Amino acid sequence: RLIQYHQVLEMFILVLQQCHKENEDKWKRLSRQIADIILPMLAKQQMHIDSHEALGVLNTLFEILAPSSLRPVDMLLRSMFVTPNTMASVSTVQLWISGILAILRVLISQSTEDIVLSRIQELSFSPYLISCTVINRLRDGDNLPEETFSRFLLQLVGILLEDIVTKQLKVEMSEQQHTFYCQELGTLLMCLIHIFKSGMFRRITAAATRLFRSDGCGGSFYTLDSLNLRARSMITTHPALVLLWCQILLLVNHTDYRWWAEVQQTPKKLGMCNRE
Amino acid sequence: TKKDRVNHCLTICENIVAQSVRNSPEFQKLLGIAMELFLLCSDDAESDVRMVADECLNKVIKALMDSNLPRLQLELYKEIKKNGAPRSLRAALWRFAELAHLVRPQKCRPYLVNLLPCLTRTSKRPEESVQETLAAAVPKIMASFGNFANDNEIKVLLKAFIANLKSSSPTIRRTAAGSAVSICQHSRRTQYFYSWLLNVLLGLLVPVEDEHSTLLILGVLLTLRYLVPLLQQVSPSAEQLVQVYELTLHHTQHQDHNVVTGALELLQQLFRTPPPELLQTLTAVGGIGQLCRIKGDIGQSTDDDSAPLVHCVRLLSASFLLTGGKNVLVPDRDVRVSVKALALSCVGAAVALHPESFFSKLYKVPLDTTEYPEEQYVSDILNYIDHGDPQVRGATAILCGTLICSILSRSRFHV
């Protein structure tokens, strides 16, 4: 009855560890009982996971649940591939992205590219779930499977970049909410670097490399140049996140000097430390 | 004659603390006659008898907090119930309020219903000194007993203090303004009671064109200024807070400098601690429309072309700081240095929310070119850094600090 609060997920970690040290078939049943409740709640933004403490406790619960309780990945996929009720507030966007980060971490640590992509092909998701059209509605109020998965993650990079560089630190968001936007973007770009650098996700890497060369498909999707405009505006405020974006550009072979000559300040007042 | 009343009050004090047995024999009689004697010694004609009696109440209270405290609070309540001479009532009321957090939960509902008749009856008291003790007492009593009230109790006590917002005494007005807000703050239903008090306080001024008394305007603007710090996180609405803002701007144009000062102080609180929906409204383009003379067109708060803080910074600058003549400064005979220092502090707070409002021309439509050869910017208010008054000069330095910080953060260092 209280499972939306991360202090109760700490108690489920305790309860699950104890049944895993006696009845292994109580551990499986309780793991199904918890997972069949939490995945619908992540899909509806009903979990209180808008902090690094709460997101870290939810990540830990997914390591402690019995692997069979998550094994047909369809309920993870049907919980991840969803829109929020709105994007007009900061809180709803953060509850939505936090729930995606939790499930993305399960897919890349407890499943495989073959299992995930073959289920994404069968379940009939599409790239257009969070097109710029959908995003623009929800900000006012209300295919190959690797192409769907890659486009979904790269649309989230756009949403986080637009919010980090356009919201204001007393009007629209608090310093704690601004901190968690940066911690979510940092977590997303580390997931993308793991996916591209590990060699375990070769079809998603090929698809993402093809997407970064694509146009916006009639303005359905963020162009690489629109993402780079936002990232260039962060050089003065968030150098650590911009260096993760530089690392992503190299993993997809974007070696265009129109980016690299700006960040490296290539030759054609004390200066700013974040630029250095 | 004189020393006898001193030695009597002191010898009963010594005996009360010396008794040591305290098993409720005759000591319950002795402590009663001691407490009533000290509350008479504390309104005696001779200053040394009063100065002694205060030590004897304080000594007996601290000597008996461990054991007989329920009786101390009851004997203090009896003197508040008498409604007697001013110092005898004060001497009971502040001590009762110090001891109020020590009441056990089972006795709070009893003490509250016994004190609603008292706090209302003593609000009707004309003495300025009884009112300064009441201003200190209500926050302390309500922080302990307010959860044991119900809405009909709270509204009776709010209406008793709201009736004093009309008073000629600034002290009676201050006691009423602080009491009403503390009564909301310590209620069960705080958000309901803030919105209810906003509806009464706006109810006293809404028509705006009507012949409202200067005294009532001063009492209501003061009550809003204590309330605003509590509204930043049924509850207060955006439009209900827009009314407070529009009203606050209107009273900056009153003929009485007391009303101008009270309006500028309310405006300073609004920009230092804005409620979220009000912040959104005042920084949004067309935000309100989506729901010592001015000398030209400065726009209106309702204009579609701009954010409301742009009109606000023009209105303050045109009313108090600038004449329309480039690099010339309003005389200190025309506008007081106190009103000037407040106007500079309001502009510095508006520029913290929306720094584009600093860069504006003072008028939307230019003045007569034959009288005014060149146009004036709001940024001429930096000339007050050379003004003779240290507070005006210091307020102008805080405007420089707030402008630099606001522009650097709004631009994300893309200056």
Cα separation, B185 vs B188, in Å, equals 9
State both tokens at A197.
């650098």
The vertex-B218 CA angle with B217 and B224, nearest 5°, equals: 85
User: Who among A168, A236, A274 is closest to B414 (CB)?
Assistant: A236
State both tokens at A229.
């405009």
Q: Cβ-count burial of B376 within 10 angstroms (0-12 exposed, 13-18 middle, 19+ buried)? A: buried
User: Who among A169, A170, A272 is closest to B413 (CB)?
Assistant: A272
What 8-state DSSP symbol labels residue B320? Answer: I
HSE-CB of B325 using CA atoms within 13 angstroms = 8
- The one-letter amino acid code at A140 reads D
Counted across chains A and B, CB pairs separated by less than 8 A come out at 18
Instruction: Tell me which residue of B117, B37, B110 sits closest to B81, measured CA to CA.
Output: B117
* CB atoms inside a 10 Å sphere around CB B358: 24
Residues of B in Cβ contact (< 8 Å) with A169 = 409
- The one-letter amino acid code at A270 reads L
Cα separation, B276 vs B128, in Å, equals 38
Experimental technique of record: cryo-EM
User: Who among A170, A171, A236 is closest to B412 (CB)?
Assistant: A236
Cα separation, A220 vs A158, in Å, equals 12
Closest chain A C-alpha to B197 CA, distance in angstroms: 26
Residue ranges in B186-237 assigned as alpha helix (H): 190-203, 214-231
Four-point Cα dihedral B409, A272, A178, A76, nearest 10: 150
Instruction: Tell me which residue of A131, A107, A103, A134 sits closest to A119, measured CA to CA.
Output: A107
Cα separation, B27 vs B38, in Å, equals 16
The vertex-A221 CA angle with A218 and A227, nearest 5°, equals: 120
- The one-letter amino acid code at A154 reads L
* CB atoms inside a 10 Å sphere around CB B328: 12
* CB atoms inside a 10 Å sphere around CB B65: 12
- The answer to whether the Cβ–Cβ distance between A233 and B283 falls below 8 Å is no
| Rama region for B3: left / alpha / beta (φ>0; ψ in -120 to 50; rest) | alpha
Helices (H) and strands (E) in chain A, counts: 13, 0
Q: Cβ-count burial of A246 within 10 angstroms (0-12 exposed, 13-18 middle, 19+ buried)? A: middle
Residues 6+ apart with CB under 8 A from A32: A66, A68, A69
Identify the contact set of chain B against chain A, taking CB-CB distances under 8 A.
Answer: 279-280, 283, 353, 409-410, 412-414
Q: Dihedrals φ, ψ of B26, to 5°?
A: -60, -10
Closest chain B C-alpha to A134 CA, distance in angstroms: 24
Residue B77: its H or E element: helix B69-82
Closest chain A C-alpha to B282 CA, distance in angstroms: 10
What 8-state DSSP symbol labels residue B405? Answer: H
| B78 contacts B66 by C-beta, under 8 angstroms | no
Residues of A in Cβ contact (< 8 Å) with B279 = 170-171
State both tokens at B187.
């209620």
Q: Cβ-count burial of B32 within 10 angstroms (0-12 exposed, 13-18 middle, 19+ buried)? A: middle
Instruction: Say how many residues make up chain B.
Output: 415
Residues 6+ apart with CB under 8 A from B151: B189
Cα separation, A156 vs A151, in Å, equals 9
| B195 contacts B234 by C-beta, under 8 angstroms | yes
Cα separation, B3 vs A271, in Å, equals 79
Closest chain A C-alpha to B355 CA, distance in angstroms: 13
Which residue of A168, A234, A242 is the best one to mutate when testing the B interface, meaning the one whose CB has the most B CBs within 10 A? A168
| B180 contacts B158 by C-beta, under 8 angstroms | yes
Q: Cβ-count burial of A156 within 10 angstroms (0-12 exposed, 13-18 middle, 19+ buried)? A: buried
Cα separation, A231 vs A253, in Å, equals 17
HSE-CB of B20 using CA atoms within 13 angstroms = 1
Residues of B in Cβ contact (< 8 Å) with A170 = 279, 353
The vertex-B226 CA angle with B221 and B232, nearest 5°, equals: 115
Residues of A in Cβ contact (< 8 Å) with B278 = none
Identify the contact set of chain A against chain B, taking CB-CB distances under 8 A.
Answer: 165, 168-171, 233, 236-237, 272, 274
Cα separation, B31 vs B75, in Å, equals 9
Cα separation, A121 vs A143, in Å, equals 8
Instruction: Tell me which residue of B193, B133, B128, B110 sits closest to B157, measured CA to CA.
Output: B193
